[PDB]
Structure formats: structure tokens, C-alpha cells
Amino acid sequence: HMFDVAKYLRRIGVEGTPPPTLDTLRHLHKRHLMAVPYDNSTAPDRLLTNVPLDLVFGHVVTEGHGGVCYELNRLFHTLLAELGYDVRMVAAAVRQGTFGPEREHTFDLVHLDGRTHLVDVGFPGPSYSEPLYLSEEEQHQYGCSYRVTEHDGYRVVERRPKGSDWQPVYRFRPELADPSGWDAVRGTTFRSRATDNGKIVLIGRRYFTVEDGVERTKVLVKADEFQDVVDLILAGA
Ligand SMILES: Cc1cc(N)cc(O)c1
Known about the structure:
This protein is α+β, with helices and mostly antiparallel strands. The chain has 2 domains: 180 residues, 2-Layer Sandwich (Arylamine N-acetyltransferase fold), CATH 3.30.2140; 45 residues, no CATH class. It has 5 helices and 13 strands. An 8-stranded antiparallel β-sheet has the order 5-4-3-2-9-8-7-6, covered by helices on one side. β11 and β12 form a beta hairpin. α3 packs across α4. It binds 3-azanyl-5-methyl-phenol.
């Protein structure tokens, strides 16, 4: 179907058309991550400007499936722009102990009332479920700590759950952000979604959960447990 803001808000469980404020941005970001799972399982059958936005919208919103970073963050960029925000696309290199290709991960920045926020509803692993300030200052979300440090002309998103040291998530160059950047974008299954107070992630057989900053992981053995976790992730919340 054709892109429709109202249909999209309904799909992620947001009522009405809330105003273009920081509180609205936080709510949209968290609802999107809870309702729209990351899922690369059929990413090959949809491969950036040469993929019409309506095809991705149809797959994710109209049909209710998940997607990957250059699908979910591309749709969310469009939604935020239609809702009145100053939104900019930026590419990142993912901590793979080394950082991978320099434009592997695509996400968004929003500039609002003199502050810049990171927006990412399309990263598979444990990462922030509400937008981060673009700041080295430490920020706290559901018991996890976050900061955006500066190292060697890169900003680096770092995360610290309970019982852990600081972990880099990905790194990016803020000055390469682009309001129109989506028009320029060039074997294991990853599936995840946010919960009310954390995130659940399945990579191959490896099941990861974080709740109030407390992490648990298990390599799944049984087929019925595997099926149950897939259903739990893909059902949304
Ligand atoms: C670690 C990872 C990051 C991204 N952006 C995509 C993937 O399939 C895996």
C-alpha cells in the first residue's frame, strides 16, 4: 500500500497524531521497537532508491512483518518528517572487536529545540529503546547506561548493562548526516524486538534478553522452545 501516516501510527499502537515534541519522539521510538521486529529472514527478496518506499511500507506496515535497518529506519525517517521533525539520515560502522564496513548500518538523527537526538528503530542487537542525546554525558534507560563518546573524529554509541563494562555499539561521523540521505544509500537469521523494559534478541540459536538492565542468554536446543521464542519476537508488543 501507499505510505500513510495514520495507518503507520495505528500499526505501532500510537493514538492520534501527537505533537512534534521530545515526549512524542520518545514514545514513537519505543512503540516502534516494540511493535515492529527486526527480521532479516526475507531481506534478500526485497533488494536503495530503486526499492519504492511503498513496497517496504506494504511489507512492514500493511502486512505487519519486520525488516532490517535500511527498511525500518527509512520508513521511520519518513514518518518523523511527516510529523514535523527535522530528521537526518546517517550511516554507521558496526562493532562486529572491530568496526565493519563504514556505511553498513543506517539510522537517523533528529534536531529538536536546539538538541540533537539519535533515532534508531532498526538495529538488531541490544541498543537504546528511547532516543539518545548526541552527548558524551551518561544517559540511563531501563537500567542500561548509554553515552556517545568522541574518538578519532568519530562519535561512538556505547552501552553498559548491569554487570558489564562499557561496550561500543557502532560509530558514525555526524557531519555526514543528510536530510535526503536515503536517496543516496548503496547467513544467520537475526530477529529482535523491544519489550516494556528491555529487549529480546534471537541470533541463530542464541537467545538474549535484557530486562531492567539485567541480561540473560541461552543457546536454544529444543525445536519447540526455538519456535516459541520466534513467535514471541515476531508477535510484537
Ligand atoms: C551486527 C549486525 C548489524 C547490522 N546492521 C546488520 C546485521 O545483519 C548484523
